[PDB]
Amino acid sequence: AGILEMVARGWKYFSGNFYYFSRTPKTWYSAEQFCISRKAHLTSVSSESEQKFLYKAADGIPHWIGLTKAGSEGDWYWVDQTSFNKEQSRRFWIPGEPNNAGNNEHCANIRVSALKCWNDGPCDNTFLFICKRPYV
Amino acid sequence: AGILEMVARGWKYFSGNFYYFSRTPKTWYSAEQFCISRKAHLTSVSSESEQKFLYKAADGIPHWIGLTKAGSEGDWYWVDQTSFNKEQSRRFWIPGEPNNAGNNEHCANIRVSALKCWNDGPCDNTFLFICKRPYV
Numbered sequence: 552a553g554i555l556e557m558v559a560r561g562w563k564y565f566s567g568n569f570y571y572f573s574r575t576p577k578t579w580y581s582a583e584q585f586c587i588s589r590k591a592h593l594t595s596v597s598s599e600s601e602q603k604f605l606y607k608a609a610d611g612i613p614h615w616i617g618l619t620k621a622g623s624e625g626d627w628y629w630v631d632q633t634s635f636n637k638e639q640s641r642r643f644w645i646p647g648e649p650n651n652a653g654n655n656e657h658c659a660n661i662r663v664s665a666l667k668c669w670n671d672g673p674c675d676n677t678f679l680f681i682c683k684r685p686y687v
Numbered sequence: 688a689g690i691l692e693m694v695a696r697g698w699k700y701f702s703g704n705f706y707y708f709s710r711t712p713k714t715w716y717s718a719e720q721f722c723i724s725r726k727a728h729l730t731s732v733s734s735e736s737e738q739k740f741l742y743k744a745a746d747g748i749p750h751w752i753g754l755t756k757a758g759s760e761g762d763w764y765w766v767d768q769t770s771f772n773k774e775q776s777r778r779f780w781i782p783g784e785p786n787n788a789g790n791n792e793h794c795a796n797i798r799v800s801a802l803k804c805w806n807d808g809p810c811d812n813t814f815l816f817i818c819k820r821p822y823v
């Protein structure tokens with residue numbers, strides 16, 4: 552509906568997209584349910600620059616993003632259905648990650664504040680979250 | 688993978704579909720994640736016959752089913768993309784449900800062992816679950 556309005560409504564703006572950083576923590580799925588109801592999806596990271604903005608604006612607090620496995624034993628996909636670049640992700644996971652700790656880590660979160668900031672963790676962990684919505 | 692091959696692994700067969708009834712409790716999404724790893728989804732309900740097979744096998748124990756909202760404020764649908772008729776479902780909901788308690792009950796389960804067994808509850812409640820894989 553327009554940049555100023557969306558900004559004025561509390562949304563962040565970075566490079567062709569609106570973002571919503573949740574004021575309360577939810578499980579990955581309850582976070583996605585909210586983003587759908589906000590005409591959005593849990594965020595994707597489709598560049599290094601977008602990764603830079605997203606870790607910065609997270610403020611060192613662990614934020615759910617929109618990476619999830621296609622089934623508890625499947626490969627990662629972006630929920631917003633953009634392509635997942637397996638190779639580009641190398642520069643985005645915290646070293647050691649994805650580690651699949653206790654074989655119950657199928658949802659990914661911005662845990663720290665660096666270029667390498669993603670951690671795989673339990674999908675039922677409650678964290679703050681980022682809804683992504685196109686500027687269309 | 689063969690009717691007798693599936694029941695020999697612990698799948699249940701009824702009227703053209705295989706169904707996995709779970710051992711351990713899980714949230715709606717993790718349940719669904721587990722489903723997909725076994726080539727299934729959480730179960731959709733198309734006929735009263737299916738409803739009756741499902742509620743009688745569920746034994747009174749609450750079991751998650753594949754009915755969820757298109758977001759926290761959106762419409763009910765089946766996660767396996769079976770078409771959901773609201774008028775047919777009227778028969779299966781517990782009288783007085785779906786109530787949407789605290790604007791928070793965004794997933795459905797088979798709560799009791801009766802025809803009127805569907806209750807809406809928060810997707811973060813941990814219950815046993817029913818996966819469904821179609822026989823082709």
Ligand SMILES: [Ca+2]
Nearest residue numbers: 650670671672
């Ligand atoms: Ca991890």
Ligand SMILES: [Ca+2]
Nearest residue numbers: 786806807808
């Ligand atoms: Ca209810």
